């Protein structure tokens, strides 16, 4: 497991993967002849393994950072990435009150939504956006993994802003700050973290690419929450402001 460093909390190797997803990743990883593409498609359904891979690929010597499993593969080679995939052989999970299935389901759905949204726009590369969507709240997984019993207490007594406040008290960090710190450790440049933080405001007025990407993130989040539960006038207005064709996003 990973040590919890109070000054600079950081989990990566120890984050769990879903049993079914791990089984399938291992199956493919042990397959005699698997493509880079098939392996990446499968691996990028898992926030834990995706993070580890990005972090490895972005570690100080390398050269430019990557933000998708397929780009990591091109950069460091399929054999190295395969090693990380086979490492699952060696969880999901200890935090009693944390809904892991819900977390994994929502993370993928959001990744998929953000990819579609950005695919019809010109802000960021959709494969990189997918990854950010996948990882947008990986800080939740990390707290649940690091402090399973303490975090179960928090989860039973609070949600929303009150949960954030409770996390700060117990851990001197919260799941959103932790996410940004993780994403920063794993190689993402600050504009992406800022766009993510922006996307979490009640209302996103900000101009520029950062504002537009933030509105795209906010839309992926709210749309994903909606299916897995229409959009408010504000969100529709923000949707219109990025420019949106609809409405295969509100279902499938």
- Shortest reach from residue 27's CB to Cl ion, in Å: 33
Q: What is the 3-state secondary structure (H, E, C) of 144-198?
A: HHHCHHHHHHHHHHCCHHHHHHHHHHHHCCCHHHHHHHHHHHCCCCHHHHHHHHH
- Shortest reach from residue 14's CB to Cl ion, in Å: 12
- Shortest reach from residue 165's CB to Cl ion, in Å: 19
Question: Site map for Cl ion, 133-172, x if CB under 5 A?
Answer: --------------x-xx----------------------
Encode burial over 222-238: b for 16+ CB neighbours within 10 A, e otherwise: bbbeeeeeebeeebeeb
Q: Is 98 in the site for Cl ion (CB under 5 A)?
A: no
- Shortest reach from residue 137's CB to Cl ion, in Å: 20
- Shortest reach from residue 230's CB to Cl ion, in Å: 40
Q: Could you tell me which of 175, 156, 170, 160 has the C-alpha nearest to residue 97?
A: 156
CB nearer Cl ion, residue 10 or residue 80: 10
Cα separation of 219 and 240, whole Å? 10
Q: Is 56 in the site for Cl ion (CB under 5 A)?
A: no
3-state secondary structure (DSSP) of residue 48: helix
Q: Is 89 in the site for Cl ion (CB under 5 A)?
A: no
Distances (CA, A) of 175 to 135, 137, 218, 227: 12, 7, 17, 23
Q: Is 13 in the site for Cl ion (CB under 5 A)?
A: no
Q: Is 96 in the site for Cl ion (CB under 5 A)?
A: no
Q: Is 3 in the site for Cl ion (CB under 5 A)?
A: yes
Q: Site residues (CB under 5 A) for Cl ion?
A: 3, 5, 147, 149-150
């Amino acid at each position: 497991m990973d040590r919890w460093n109070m000054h600079k909390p950081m989990l990566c190797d120890s984050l769990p993967t879903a049993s079914r997803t791990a089984a399938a990743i291992l199956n493919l990883a042990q397959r005699e002849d698997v493509t880079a593409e098939a392996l990446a498609q499968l691996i990028q359904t898992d926030p834990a393994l995706t993070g580890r891979i990005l972090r490895f690929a972005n570690a100080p010597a390398t050269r430019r950072p990557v933000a998708s499993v397929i780009d990591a593969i091109d950069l460091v080679g399929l054999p190295a990435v395969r090693q990380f995939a086979l490492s699952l052989s060696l969880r999901e999970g200890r935090c009693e009150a944390f809904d892991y299935a819900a977390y994994w389901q929502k993370s993928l759905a959001r990744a998929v939504a953000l990819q579609s949204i950005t695919a019809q726009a010109s802000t960021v590369a959709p494969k990189e956006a997918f990854t950010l969507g996948l990882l947008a709240d990986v800080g939740r997984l990390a707290l649940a993994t690091a402090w399973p019993e303490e975090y179960s207490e928090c989860l039973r007594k609070a949600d929303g802003e009150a949960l954030i406040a409770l996390e700060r008290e117990r851990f001197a960090t919260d799941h959103d700050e932790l996410t940004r710190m993780l994403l920063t450790d794993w190689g993402f440049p600050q504009v992406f973290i800022d766009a993510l933080q922006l996307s979490q405001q009640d209302e996103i007025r900000d101009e520029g690419r950062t504002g537009r990407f933030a509105r795209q993130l906010a839309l992926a989040q709210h749309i994903a929450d909606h299916r897995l539960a229409a959009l408010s006038p504000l969100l529709r207005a923000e949707a219109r402001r990025c420019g949106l064709g609809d409405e295969d996003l509100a279902r499938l």
